[model samples]
Target: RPRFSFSIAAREGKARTGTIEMKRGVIRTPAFMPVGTAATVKALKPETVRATGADIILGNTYHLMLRPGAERIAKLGGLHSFMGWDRPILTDSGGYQVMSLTKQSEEGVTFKSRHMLSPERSIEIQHLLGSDIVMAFDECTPYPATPSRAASSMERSMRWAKRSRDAFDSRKEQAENAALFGIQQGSVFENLRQQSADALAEIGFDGYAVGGLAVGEGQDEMFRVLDFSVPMLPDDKPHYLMGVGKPDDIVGAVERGIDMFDCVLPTRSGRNGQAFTWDGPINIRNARFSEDLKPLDSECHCAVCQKWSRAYIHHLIRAGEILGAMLMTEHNIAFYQQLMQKIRDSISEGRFSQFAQDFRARYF
Candidate 1:
């Protein structure tokens, strides 16, 4: 099989449907990669996650480095073996987490833990973890930033993108086997976003990501940024929106031409008793659900939804049972995957516009 290739099988306006073939597996475009922080995707097991129709999962470099350490995972036969998930695993650079701990220089960011994380070091950590898709280290430009700060931060990120490219390319074997993604950062300034995109295009990579949003900007602001930023990325490559949110946000991003997404909202919210449904999000802990016998989502066909009722799930949550969290998380992830399938289907059928309209009509 080819090391990496992306094919746009269909399109509707700016929306796209396709597949990303990697050595590990194929990731369906307009895909939702579950955030598998700390090796596991919280309460669900790897197979359970796979059963949700997820082709890839994301691991955080910062968390792994701080806890088990990348070196330790590498010694244990990489993250795949350590986690027992044999599919594609995309690992982010530790930049997001390190942003809070230290002062950054042209060289790199130094953490309060005294660990200096440079572009090269960040690449090394992802490499050590045997990431299938390696993200370039970047400062997630804080939201509500002054124009000047956004410019300087974006420029610095471009420099780091180049360094990351070089470091990743130097690992001849890994470079040949894996894919690197450059990140575009510019708080919401279209000019800065374009400049960052141009810089990344000059360096080049397997994919491009729109970082620095979803920090605090509301949905409207975030959608406005993607309206331009997504177009700035290379059309042939995958466009990833980092840390994006709700079902609506994902649908909106896809409408704007984004192809990949990773966020903790589904599982994280699942643990908090919030379950996403076709209608919208519903809190299972609500008194009304305490006796409701319906599934979390009547439209869903996930195992949890097929056999479990809201009343039981509500009881589990109120009783503080581990099974409750597991069931809820399983259903949320399945709902996300189901949503992606519907999006892909609509795009393929050239009805994504209508689908988006009707979806927002009820999902909001």
Candidate 2:
């Protein structure tokens, strides 16, 4: 069984700093977890991910179950051993993938694997993976949905949420070490969001997640939902925003009292030839960087930025070399880690308000 505890060290406005002590390791709050969708953070190794100062990495139940098979991973000794990552891992429920990527009708959801077979188990698969943080199964309502469509989807998700809760209860003994989180979905509807939150709170969970956002909903709309949703959850437990966002989005969410986040922007952008820097996001493939002698970011202390030059990085990308992706990914991960560190520090020092103001003025 995995024993865990959380501690709040400081608070500045709604932005707070804290630590989550788990059996595997300690995770600092206001932290950003890079998405390692298929047991890996593309273009980087587990050691490289750790070196970037990440406390944890997120694994998707949809991808892992479809490709490698959760049973296969269990035979190899759970996700941590299979992936060679000793730090904590949070596995998202296959909910979002099912609703968005798969075809849906009246009979639950049909998932046809790219491997030419159907997925055997759904939420059961997440339990098999021994996920440290198990997300409750719920749909990520499609964007631009009508009020009625959104309401229907949210209501359906609430039913699934109950089933997910029941399944977790049934496996509680076997999953003594793991934690289950319930997802609240209402798709920009305040009343529906409130209803979902109330139901999940009644069902009970170790954590709560504000899901179904960032799916074509602009920043203002997403934040509006969070503003109403987050405070409705239990304050003692962690509040996660699944598959969220850019650097600025994370900062804004933190200010609204969110504790955890996971996103693919940093690593995914890096593989596609983009690099996020202090000044702003930049494309490494641009011709303007051909004569640049500076590092990826002069302010960065990561090994990639410390050891490689912008000119070399640019040459590799232009030449279509894999090293370019790897280096860029490393730096991007480091940049996110550095950002988390700054947020933690500012919160602890009671200056998050000032820091956030300065960051927005420059980045926005």
Candidate 3:
């Protein structure tokens, strides 16, 4: 197995542009991984997704484990074969889903499956999926939690992280090509976060993630935790910030040394008739666009923006046509990928500070 190596191509303050060379593929720095929760990116085909310049995609353990079962997929051929996607896929441990959707008890989170349940699977199912990047199972500490509640939950997650690590280590084939990332879950407590980071470092992993954030903790507080938490983890490994955020959030997290991120906002908001652009987000369904002959963003080079008008998109959305969602989603994905490329370019050129300031000034 070849070890993953990260090389910093350039930097401006804490912001950096780099690349991750893995056996599977090369992931560009300041990368945005589109969520492909159920083995697909929804409304987009694999070729189309790749055409948008995304280096990787994300999968969910909770969803895949319940439906196809990891063993079944392994037997059929790994998740890459099952999904028809050859690029690298990162799988979340489903810890967030376990906390949000299941009935929590002392043993672990238990929930009736939306699909048929099979008795043969557990969190280790991610290992069976042959995910390129596997997240260690940990609950996403809910917001507004009491101090004791947060502490207790964080400790339980630490225990689970150890189990997840052990499970990954025991899987001979999966442990070779795949990399496991430990999720840090300490709510908003500085000391708890420090302790969580230390434990994960001691246990060791291929990467580390800043989790349990962007769950309504507000941006200010989330940045505060990241300020202290990011520096505690080993700098050599890739730093991922899970379930994070809008364009601005990406900029801020990158400034704090986060290398990778995943979010459903672009696709979800696109389906809801919202389009993100360099200027800002605009609702295509708004009546003002009914007569606007301009593209969603004149500067954007996506197929949708190059071929369609805001007026046409607005009409399709108002008429409830599926093309509206498809085109908008395509445009949004392209916009995000372009944003990431720009960030990478700025850092490599030593101009990220000016770029960040200019971006916030215009967008915010």
- The candidate maximizing TM-score is 1
lDDT of 3 by residue, 250-317 (tens): 99999898989999999999989999988899999999999999999989988888999999999998
- Would you list the clashing residue pairs of candidate 3? none
lDDT of model 3, residue 110: 68
Model 3 scores a C-alpha lDDT of 0.83
Q: Give the true-structure RMSD of model 3.
A: 2.3
The regions of model 2 sitting more than 4 angstroms off are 102-107, 113-120, 172-174
Candidate 3's error at 85, in angstroms? 1.3
Per-residue lDDT value at 132 in model 2: 74
Q: Estimate each model's TM-score.
A: 0.98, 0.94, 0.94
Q: After superposition, how far is residue 186 of candidate 2 from its true place, in Å?
A: 0.7
* Model 3 quality (TM-score): 0.94
10 residues in a row with least lDDT, candidate 2 = 113-122
